[PDB]
């Protein structure tokens, strides 16, 4: 139904997959929230894309999977966490749970305390990365994530979309 509103920079399949999520639907600004949620997903895909550890994908992406499935994954890997929300990714190399946060943001996100087995990737819409994020992500990951963010940021400046997302 909202298809006319999909940014060019979001893939059709990610946009379609986002219909399985009630999160953006619960927001008072649902289109803006849906775009941000798709940005978050896309960032998870760039972090994980073709990155291997011991010959197989380094990461398990839990975002947009059922929490009971993510729990199966966490139990099978013995990577267990105690937040209400499950990590967005499991990093099987570092043995960490990864949470991704997107800041509609002129500015660089600030790092705040996490548990020892957690990493919080914190990125702005304008392509900025928190200090802990920049250190955690490798050069290829930083490039892939930032090039995507800058692409959608620059698309959003061509309409009222960036301003609207800043109104989240």
Residue numbers in the entry: 0 to 167
Quote the paper.
The three largest gene segments of the Thogotoviruses, THOV, DHOV and JOSV are homologous to those of IAV and code for the heterotrimeric polymerase. In this paper we present the atomic structures of the putative PB2 cap binding and 627 domains of THOV and the putative PA N-terminal endonuclease domains of THOV and DHOV. Despite very low sequence homologies, all domains have similar folds to those of the corresponding IAV polymerase domains. However, the critical active site residues in the putative cap binding and endonuclease domains are not conserved in THOV and DHOV and, contrary to the case of IAV polymerase, neither domain shows the expected in vitro biochemical activity.
To overcome this problem, we produced the homologous domain from DHOV PA (40% identity between full-length THOV and DHOV PA, 29% for the N-terminal part), which readily crystallized and the structure was solved by the Single wavelength Anomalous Dispersion (SAD) method using seleno-methionine labelled protein. The resultant model was then used to solve the THOV PA-Nter structure by molecular replacement. The three domains clearly have the same fold, and THOV and DHOV PA-Nter are very similar. For THOV and DHOV PA-Nter the putative active site is more like an extended groove and furthermore, is positively charged. Indeed of the cation binding residues, only an equivalent of influenza Asp108 (PD motif) is found in THOV and DHOV PA-Nter, respectively Asp-86 and Asp-87. The extra positive charge in the putative active sites of THOV and DHOV PA-Nter arises from the replacement of acidic residues and the introduction of extra lysines (Lys38, Lys61 and Lys97 for THOV and Lys39 and Lys100 for DHOV PA-Nter). Using the Thermofluor assay to measure apparent melting temperature (Tm), we found that in the absence of any divalent cations, the Tm of THOV and DHOV PA-Nter domains were respectively 41 and 53°C compared with 44°C for IAV. For the DHOV domain, which is already more stable, addition of these ions has little effect, giving no indication of cation binding. Finally, neither THOV nor DHOV PA-Nter show any nuclease activity against various RNAs under conditions where IAV PA-Nter does. Our structural and biochemical results therefore strongly suggest that THOV and DHOV PA-Nter domains neither bind divalent cations nor are active endonucleases.
